[model samples]
Target: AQSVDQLIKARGKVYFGVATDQNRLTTGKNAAIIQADFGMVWPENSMQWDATEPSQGNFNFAGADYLVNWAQQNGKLIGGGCLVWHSQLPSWVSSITDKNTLTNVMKNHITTLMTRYKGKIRTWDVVGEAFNEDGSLRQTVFLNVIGEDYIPIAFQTARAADPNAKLYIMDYNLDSASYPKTQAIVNRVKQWRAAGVPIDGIGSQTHLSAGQGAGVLQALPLLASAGTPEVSILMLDVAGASPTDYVNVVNACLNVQSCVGITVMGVADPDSWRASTTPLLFDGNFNPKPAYNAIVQDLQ
Candidate 1:
């Protein structure tokens, strides 16, 4: 039988979850997370594009579906993935030279999967990495094909499929103190909202290094101005060069009133690092590391 300990209590304190790689979903680590009673879930990064829809017009939901089922079975909240990230799509989807077809293909894939998992999912990163540092549309397959119109289209589709769910446009370090991309995204969100787009929230994927501080605090006003009162700080995979830096992030979140919640990825120990490299709080053996303890202790 599974036993409860400080680690399990720590996991219970906050929205503890793992940003699982596709392979780890079936592993003992995932099983332990389920048994430990973690309250949330994030998809394996690579499982986003390549694993979901490999070939043009062909989508294999095997891996993602497994994650959804796992979350439902264990009564855990699920978030992240279901977007156009470089890590997730097949080569053909990425190589599609035709813009319209690429846009259509991406839209179709997103709609199909999102619709299937509509009410089941709590939040979604509808469009991932679609903007440059300056807030201009990133020269990605989706932008190259669908143009700026794709953003509103994605929001519309997500709303149509799951009107009650929180739809977020997740991006990395957009909340960094000096990143213009962050402001650019906020501005775009305002424009979309003014135009009657149905965007609900903004996800700041806080993949921070040491010294970044809680830059997300700087971005909160932008989110509010953009009509997004809800924010999620995706702090899994954040690598601070020092332990103090990591703790500072957690404390910073605690200090902020606008901040909704924080998630730490499971990166347990050297052995667990060897087993999986997604940078979470647990090692391969499902042991909590110093960082994990620090976060839990700080929360307490």
Candidate 2:
């Protein structure tokens, strides 16, 4: 029988990715399961600002390096996330008042991290959660201090830092029926593209959902109709969902051409951020739930 990764690759479509961290990866069981099932992996938080560089002028790759090194050594693709985000920031970042200092700090941060992992980490969620659910800009430190132009600065800086990496802005609430939030993010990306921004795509992150197949279908045109090669994202966290719902959700992604990858936020239900309810493919003990078979069979 083919493994999960083989089934995905057989389709010759998107890669099968999973969210995991170096800490959990340190455990042989988690590592084994991830390696066996996933062809690509995103370091859940190790690659984020909090884990990579917690203090100003101080860079710590001890944890992140382990995951990157492991991904390279084991022949798995790694997706680095959030080059600049609103949250998980340390003290100095939140206190900046001067625009020059803010821009310089942002530039230095992106340059330092990207230059370190230069050729690795094929795709990056460069900027995350820039918009709120209400279709307005989230009042983040980056936006409040630097204003809306901060988005352009971030993409420009990231491009200069790593010209080869695929840059994306990831956000949630974009895949719903009417797609108000999705359109808002698309509008920003279109604005960037018109000005020749070097960004690539957006990661459409889903928390809990309703009619996800339709949601993904709605998302396809919003990303593709823009006429830019900017798409591929996360789509999971099916809390309070029946086991069968996962099949339709997985099918939603399979039918979309621009959907480069599909990543559930957690590997197992118990370890999931939405752990109160069963919201993942596996149980607390790392056992597959009913959706596991449904998902694997459909993805095949």
Candidate 3:
């Protein structure tokens, strides 16, 4: 059988990718599998705030650079790890007391990274995990100090830095239209678009358990109506999910024209952030799991 990426490419426009860390890249089997199986590579965390810039003004691109360079050399596209989020933020930015100060800090971070990797990363999770479960905003440093304006600011800044890049607002549990957080994200994207903000896409960070597939089919169109050109199923993981679960997810994405691609959060089960649940398409030993075959069969 052809590889996952090759099969997906045959369908046109969409890609199949996995979140890969440096450790996974160093492993001979993992690296070889990545190059063979996926069309895109998303850095797991090396490009995040804490890893890229730990101190106030100082920067470090060693880890992220390694991954990006490898992807370029291997003929794989890159998904920007993320830009603005409440988590993995350095203390220096989190501790900022002044609203204006926080704004400047946020802008600098966006501008620096986007500028540096301008052409490499075509789609970015520009703002991630900003909504609460009940459809309200989460109270993070960006929310507390800079107010809701931080969301648009991040996307706008990212657009200016890299005009060609597709900017996305991403969050988990958004694969279901029934989820309050899902509508909240769609509404927010609409509001941003209304005011001419540069929000290019919506990323449903579809971290799911088994049995949530129906909701994904219902949710993609609703998210796309927010007027974005693309909708990505990001960081997808389904705990104890069967092949049917994987089939449902892939079918949902394939049916929707706006749904561009998927980034499986785990390369292999043991390396997944949700390692305890075995939520990936590959097992710990880097062998393809039932979910992987399910997707390949469907794509074929």
Candidate 4:
């Protein structure tokens, strides 16, 4: 059977493979096709601020370096990972009482990482989730320390680090009208572009549920009008309640001209995991399922 990487690239599409230090890169089997320039490096647990810089001044790049070198040597594109989640942070930095210190730590980490991977990484999620439905900050550690300016500051820092790369502000559900938080984020992106900030893209992480497909589709036009920056629907970490639901959402995305690419997520499935929910395309043995055939049929 053809590997997932092979199947994706055969259609002249880029494949964004998620990796950690543990999995690393498979150099011979799946790795050969991945060596092609169509691959995009995605760090599963390395790019998050907390994971990269655990303590205030201390930095860790063991995992990130592995992926970066692999991409660079293989001549593949690199997309930095989950850069905004507060859950990955070390206690020392997260527990800081002084806002200035926290802000400094975040700014330093962004500067350091982006500079290190400057020429190599082609795209990055500058600010992840910085708003609530009411158009307020999401009460994250960065928000508390750096305030609303953190979003634009991160973008500016990334642009300075890699002027040639596309800077993306990735967020979830910023499309649904029922969710005011999405609108708030869209407004902020518009605001930043108006001020002459060098933001290149907006990534909508489409974590859609079965019932939310139509709602998500309806919100596309509004999302497109968010800013002058090019909008891209990044189906990262995306899963649906059912196979039909997944097809509806994926088809909706492909229909929209603004939708650039879609990523099918994976988790090592247990017997319990399969019993609890619908099985994904790749089975426990890493074999293709019926849904895989359906997806391939749709893609063709």
Candidate 5:
């Protein structure tokens, strides 16, 4: 097989990617394997606020810093997750009652992190898991307390931090929803563009392909029609899947002009949260799954 990274480049698409944890990469060996195969690396936990900003006015960069520094050292593309999410927050943030204070805190959150990694990051998952399976906005703390302004404000804040980095609105269930939930996001993107928000893309977090064909197909056209062209699926899982299953997803992504790339959620089974179910591209010890050769064959 040719260089997968170069092959992706030749096709003007994205290099194969694998998410990793900073905790496991402490020995530096896995990071080497990651860099050799993946052109982009998204931190699974390190960059999230739960790890970065656990308390008010206090930020812990130790866990994410190691990975951030490693990404820089290896010249790997980095994508940070979520300036604002309902979950993974310290009590102070989750329990905040005042809109003004929460707004200030949210803006500060985006600025501090984005400024720290301004030049290095390729994109930021500015806001994540914001919609329901029905495509209606999820009842998030930001939505419930801070109101709808949080989404645009977050994007604008990220733009204020890193003008060059792309900002994406990321969510789950966009792949297999039964409703027009995906279209709801496309409409939201339309509103964002009208409002001059710096949102650059729409993202699918579920990354499931089974029975998701109808929604996925509909979602692609909606995004294109709604003036939102860039779309990518962030966390692809391969639980109980075969090479053909992986290839089906690859082909779907390839067929969509706007679908940017699909990054496998875990490199190997044990590294995944669903380790019990073997939901990843590699087995334990980081050996490629049968899906790897199938993907390579498709690349050729």
Candidate 6:
């Protein structure tokens, strides 16, 4: 009964979560740990454009459906994934040359997914990684064709499709104030909110290095200044971090009032994208590491 999620909720925290895919959830070892430890569950890529609709007008919800079903059975909250992003897009989407065609495409994509899973997946990353590191817009097909309007368009479409869902703008390497990308995201959130884009949260991927605790603390208020009701630590991992380092990152979130929750990148080190660096709370054998205990102690 004294689990990580239990402690987090006992402290009146929103949720403590982890990201996983359909493939990784097959093993009971992983599933048991996830169900016991986390209050929320996120699909790593199962809901993306390429994964959901590889070809126009054709759709596949197998992966997303499985994850959602598991979450429901286990009483875990769900995070609907990136609805609009430059990467993992189907070739058909990236190859579009006309503005109207692309606009309709994005609308259809957002509407279809959000409408289908509206209530079950209550939170989403409506847009992600749309800026360059130098604080300029990334020149993706959406930007080149639809200009800057694509960002708002995607959020608006998502809003219309799922009126109650919480929407967020997500990106990586935003744990520091020194990064222009962080400010760019803040600026865009303000601009979008001022223009009535129906945005609700900002999600920093928080893919930090082993010693960037202060940076995570520093960026929290900067992101909250955009006037969103919530801020989340998404896909958090500190490469080569010790238990001490884990406490620092966890404590940073605890210090920020608007910081709603934290989602670790995965359940175990071996399954992490940064596998070599072991950037997770659990070891390769699915044993809770000292870092996991560190967070548990902090939450307690």
lDDT of 4: 0.62
lDDT of 4 at 74: 72
| Residues 9-36 of candidate 6: C-alpha lDDT, one tens digit per residue | 7766789999997899997478989888
Alpha carbon lDDT of each predicted model: 0.64, 0.76, 0.86, 0.62, 0.75, 0.86
What TM-score, computed on C-alpha atoms, does each candidate reach?
0.82, 0.93, 0.97, 0.81, 0.92, 0.97
Question: What is the alpha-carbon lDDT of model 1 when measured against the actual structure?
Answer: 0.64
Q: What tens digits encode model 4's per-residue C-alpha lDDT throughout 71-151?
A: 777766677855555666677766666767766666677788888887787677777766665777788867777677777
Can you write out model 1's per-residue Cα lDDT over 1-300, one digit (the tens) per residue?
232223433443335455654466665666666447356777755347777776766777777777788778877778857565654567787677776676677677777778778788877878777778777888776777767787888888777777867888877756565578877888888888889888777777666554564554565555555667566667445453244555666555555444455554543434233333324455556676565666656655
The residue-level lDDT of candidate 5 at 275 comes to: 76
RMSD of each: 4.0, 1.9, 1.2, 3.8, 2.2, 1.3
- Deviation of model 3 at 227, angstroms: 1.5
Output the better candidate (3/5) by lDDT.
3
| Cα shift from native, residue 227, model 1 (Å) | 2.9
Candidate 3 ranges with C-alpha deviation above 4 Å: none
Q: Give the TM-score of candidate 4.
A: 0.81
For model 5, residues 1-300, the per-residue Cα lDDT tens digits are 234555665667865666777776765356666777777788888888888988888998787777788878886788788678777677778788889998999999889999888788887889988888677788877888889888888888888899998788887766643357766887888988998988888877755544443355555555555565577767878556467767766766677777677777866676677777676766776677777777778877
Residue pairs clashing, model 4: 132-181, 133-180, 133-181
Residue 151 displacement in candidate 5 (angstroms) = 0.9
lDDT of 3 by residue, 121-199 (tens): 9788888889899989999989999998998788888889999998888888787788788888888889889999998
Candidate 5 whole-model C-alpha lDDT, 0 to 1: 0.75
Q: Which window of ten consecutive residues has the lowest lDDT sum in model 4?
A: 266-275
User: After TM-score superposition, what is the CA distance of residue 235 in candidate 5 from its true location, in Å?
Assistant: 1.2
